[PDB]
A = this chain, B = another copy of it.
Amino acid sequence: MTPTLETKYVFTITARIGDVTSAGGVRRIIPILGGEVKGEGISGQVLPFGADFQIIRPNELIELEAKYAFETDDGAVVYVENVGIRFGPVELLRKLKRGEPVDPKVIYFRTRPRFETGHPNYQWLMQYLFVGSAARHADRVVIDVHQVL
């Protein structure tokens, strides 16, 4: 019997982004300006600070390393650390890097968000591992967060 893994979609972080700044493989920084969080029991707004600090590998692959927060309706403040990778066929990666729209289903964009809260309700966010499956647009990054069971 081959080993099995079960996961569960729980919620979606949409993060609004701004212009990129590049250091020169290549280090670049993309500011997080806002956004929202939506799922069963989760409703909150991404806070207007933080950035994704990225490395572009020589093969056009993107190491993502974002640190931000969100605040739920409850008053729970949740620190987000979202680490991962975006890859796929090279010509499609050059389109995104331009701002030109690409179908997210054709791209590989997977992350591991970690969460930190002291809020008693959202302690579960620290007791499980999560995998994100994301989508890149010019103005936003849509992350579908799945709970590893």
Contact = CB atoms under 8 A, between A and B. Distances in A.
Contacts of A140: none
Given A29-B79, A129-B131, A23 B116 contact: yes
B49 A29 contact: yes
Interface in A49-64: 49-51, 53, 61
A148 interface: yes
Given A27-B118, A29-B69, A133-B3, A108 B85 contact: no
A46 B58 CA distance: 27
Nearest to A8: B5
- Interface residue range, chain A: 35 or more
Given A24-B119, A116-B27, A131-B129, A79 B67 contact: no
A23 B118 contact: yes
A128 B110 contact: yes
A67 B49 contact: no
CB-based closest 6 A-B pairs: A24-B118, A3-B144, A31-B49, A110-B129, A23-B79, A23-B77
